C-alpha cells in the first residue's frame, strides 16, 4: 500500500515529521512529496526542500522524498498512490483541505484523501509560523529538524 | 495485516455510514464495523437491531466484520487488535469534537492512530439524527438509507 | 406574489426573531411566522402561548401571519405555498447545523428555497435559550425581549 | 424587486451559476454585478469577466451582467437594489461576509444582505481552486461554462 | 487590588482547571474559583464534594478562595465586587457560545471584564464530560486529574 | 502590572480603542504596541501609526504607544509586560490567535496572553475593512478617531 503526504514544506517541521512518522506506521512506502507551489513564493528553492526533506527523513526506512511541479492527482496516479496524507490542524486547514479531496476525487476517484492528527506538542505550529519567529531572530530549534534549523539561519543571515 | 476499526452508535447505519466503511475495505485488509451500545444516547434500535442492519447493508463487502460493544472503545480497538481507528469527518462540528476523542484514544491506546475519511459530497449534511427526526415527522428519508434499514425503520415508526 | 416561511420555536419570541421577521416583510410579499411544535425540546411556554405572543408582538407588521404547527415543516411549508424559507444566522454553530438543514429541506422540498439572514449587532449574540437561563437566575432580559413577552416571562417564573 | 449578487467572477464558475440561478426564482430582476477588485490582481480584466458572465448567463432571462469599480453600496442603491445576494459556502467566508454585511448596513440600512445555499455538487468549488487545477492542465470542464473553460484554457496556454 | 472571578460547574476539577485558576493567579490579587450548582446539568458530584475537592487541589495557591453558589453568575459576581471574569479556552466551540455569554455577562453587569487565557497544550483538548465519560466505561483518567479528584472519582465509580 | 496590547494598527480604528480603554481598566500600565510588519506591506509607515495611535489614545491617561520591529516575545520581556492583550473577534482571528499564544508561552513562559471582547458595535470591523471601504470613498467616519479619518483621507487622495 503506498501513500503520498504532499505539501510546500518550505520548510519541513517537526509537524510534518510528526504526520510522515505516523504515515509509515500504517502504510507499507510513503511518498514525502513536495509541490514547487510558485504561486507561494516559497523561502526555499524546491531542490532545498528536497534535500531538507531528505536529510530530516533519513532515519525512517520507508520514506521517500521527491519534488513535482504536476497537478497533485497526476502525480499520485503517476506514483502508484491512493492514499493521500494531510496533517489535521486547525478549521482554516480542515476546509480548505476539504476542498482539495473532493477535487481530487473528482480527478482520481480511486484515491483516498485521508486526515492524520498530530501530537498536541506540534498542534500550534505551521513553517509560516515558524519563519516569521525566525525572521525576528527567535529561537526555533524545538520546532525543527537541526539540519533545517541551519539552513533557516543561513537563509536569513 | 492492518485491522482497522470503524467505531459508532449507527442508529441506524445510513448511506453515509456505508460510504466511510467501503472507502475503508479499499485501504484496510480488514476492518471492524464496531457498534457502541451507546445507552445514554437512548437509541432507536437495539444493539441486536443495529448490529443485524449492519450486517445485510455491508454484506457484499468481503472484508467487513459486524461487532456489537459496551466496553470504553479504545479497550474494544485493544482486544481486537486493531491499530487503525475510522472517523468520518464532514463538516466543522465533526472536527473539534473528534479531535477532542482523538487526543483522548491516543492518550488511552498510543499504538492506535485514528484516521479521518470524508464522505461523498451526497452524504456530507446527514446524520443519523437528522434522518431519525425526518422520518419521525413524517419526512422522505428513502434516499439516505440501505434498502433493509429504510424497511426497519419504517415499521419501528408505525407502532412507536 | 412571493410566500416566505419563517419557522422556529419562538420560546418565547425575542427582539432577535423580530429583528429577522421585520426584514423578511420588506423583502417578501407575505411572510408566515410559523411556530413549531417542538414536543422534543419540552418548551417553557405552550404553542398557543407562544403564538399569541407572537401575534401581538408582530401585529404592526400588516403581512405577517403568525401560525402554529406539529408538522414536518417541509410538509407545512408546501401546504402553505411557501417557496422561500427564512432562516436567521448569528454565527459559525447557527451557520453548521442550519446548512445540514437546508439541504435535508431542500431535498424534502426541492422548490421551497432556503434564504439566510442576518440580525442588527443588537441581537447577534442572543438566543430564547439564554434569555430562558438568565431570566431563570434572576437576570434582567428586559432589554431582548417585546413589552408583552418580557410580562409573560415574568408571570411565568413568579409561578414555577 | 431587485437583487444584486455582487462579486469578482474571476472566473465565473457552475457555483455562481447555481446561485444566481436560484436568485432569479426568488427575485424579479437580479443584477450580476463584478467587481473590478485590482487589490486581488485578477487573472481576467474586468471587460473579459463581464463577457463571461454575460454569455454564461445568457439563457436566463432575467439576469443583467455588469462591472463596477465603486463601493458596493453605492452601486447597489445605484442599481435601485434592496436585497445582495451571496453564496454561502465555508466558515471563512461565512465570517468575511458577516463583515461585508454589517458593513454594507451602516451604509445603505436598506439593503438587505441575505444569503443563498449552493447544491452538493458545488459546495466545495472557488474560482481560485479552479484556477490552481487549470493551472496545472487539470481537467475543469465539470466545474465551468463552456465558454469560460475556452477561456482559461486561452488565458494559460 | 483586582478581584477576579474564575466560575464553572468543575464537575470535577481537573489539570486544565488547575492550569487556568493557576494562570489567573499569577494575574490578578485575588482569585474567588467559584463553583456553579448547576442542577440542570445532573452534575456527577454533590456541590460541597466538588467544593472540598478544589480546595485541596487549589491549597497551595495562597490568593485562591474556593466559594459555591447557586444564583446568577453575574449576581455573584457583583456581590463578591470582582471586576474580572476569568473563562479557559480551548478551542471554536468555546469561542462561540463563550462570546454569546460575554456579552450578555456584560449586559447584566458592564463592570465586569471578560477576559480568556488558555491552558497549556496539554490539557487544550479536554473537559470534564469526556474525562467523566472515559472514567465510567473503565479508560484511564488519571493524567488528566488532581491525585485527590483521581482518588474521588474512583470511589464515586466504585458504588455508582 | 504591565500589559502590553500588540498588533499591526494600520491604522489603529475605534476597535482597538475599544480593546485597550478595556485593557487600562484592568491593569496599571497599558503599552500599546505597533509592529512594524514590513511582510504585511502597511499603507501607513510605522512613525505614521505610532502618531495616529499616540493622537487617539491621549485622554487615556495610563496607555504609552511604541512601535517595534523585534521578536514580540522580547520586546514584551523587556518592557517588562508580563500580559499580552489581543481583541477575540472571529473564528479566522481565534485560531491564529491561539498558534502565536502557544509560540510566546514556549519563548517566554511568564507572558500570559489573553483575550478581551470587543463591544457588539465593533465586533465586524478591521483596519483592512475600514480601508476597503475608504479606497471607495465610502464614509468610514463612524469606525475611526478624528485624526486617524483624516490621515486615511490624506493618504488615499
Ligand atoms: C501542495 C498542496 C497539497 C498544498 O495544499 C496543493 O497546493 C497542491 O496539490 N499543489 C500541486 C498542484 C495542484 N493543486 C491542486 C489543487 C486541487 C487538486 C489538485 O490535484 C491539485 N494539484
Ligand atoms: C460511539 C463513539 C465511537 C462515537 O463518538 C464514541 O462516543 C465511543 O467511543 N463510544 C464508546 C464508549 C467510549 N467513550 C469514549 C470517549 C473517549 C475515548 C473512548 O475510547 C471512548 N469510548
Ligand atoms: C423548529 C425548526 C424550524 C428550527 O431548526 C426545525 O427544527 C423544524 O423544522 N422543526 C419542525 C419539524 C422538522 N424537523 C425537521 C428537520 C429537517 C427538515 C424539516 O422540514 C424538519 N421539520
Ligand atoms: C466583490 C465583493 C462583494 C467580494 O466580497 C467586495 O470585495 C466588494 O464589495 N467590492 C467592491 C468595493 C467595496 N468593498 C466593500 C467592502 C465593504 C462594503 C462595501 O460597500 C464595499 N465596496
Ligand atoms: C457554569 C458557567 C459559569 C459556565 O458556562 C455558566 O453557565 C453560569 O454562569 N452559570 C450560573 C448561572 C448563570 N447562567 C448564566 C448565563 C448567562 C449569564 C450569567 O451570569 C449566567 N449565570
Ligand atoms: C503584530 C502581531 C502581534 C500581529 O498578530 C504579530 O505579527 C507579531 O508579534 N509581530 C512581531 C514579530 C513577531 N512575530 C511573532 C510570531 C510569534 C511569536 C513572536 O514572539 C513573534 N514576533
Not at 531538507?52 to 498512490?81: C, P
Request: hydrophobic content about 45%; charged content about 20%; cysteine-free.
Amino acid at each position: 500500500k503506498r501513500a503520498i503526504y504532499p505539501g510546500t514544506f518550505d520548510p519541513i517541521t517537526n509537524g510534518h515529521i510528526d504526520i510522515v512518522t505516523r504515515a509509515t506506521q500504517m502504510f507499507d512506502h510513503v511518498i514525502l512529496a513536495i509541490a514547487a507551489s510558485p504561486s507561494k513564493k516559497p523561502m526555499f528553492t524546491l531542490e532545498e526542500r528536497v534535500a531538507l526533506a531528505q536529510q530530516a527523513t533519513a532515519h525512517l526506512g520507508n520514506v521517500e522524498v521527491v519534488g513535482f511541479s504536476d497537478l497533485m492527482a497526476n502525480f499520485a496516479r503517476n506514483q502508484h498512490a491512493t492514499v493521500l496524507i494531510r496533517g489535521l490542524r486547525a478549521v482554516a486547514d480542515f476546509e480548505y483541505e476539504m476542498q482539495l479531496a473532493h477535487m481530487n476525487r473528482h480527478l482520481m476517484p480511486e484515491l483516498e484523501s485521508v486526515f492524520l492528527m498530530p501530537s498536541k506538542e506540534w498542534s500550534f505550529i505551521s513553517s509560516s509560523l515558524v519563519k516569521e519567529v525566525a525572521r525576528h531572530q527567535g529561537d526555533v530549534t524545538h520546532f525543527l529538524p537541526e539540519n533545517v534549523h541551519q539552513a533557516l539561519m543561513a537563509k536569513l543571515a
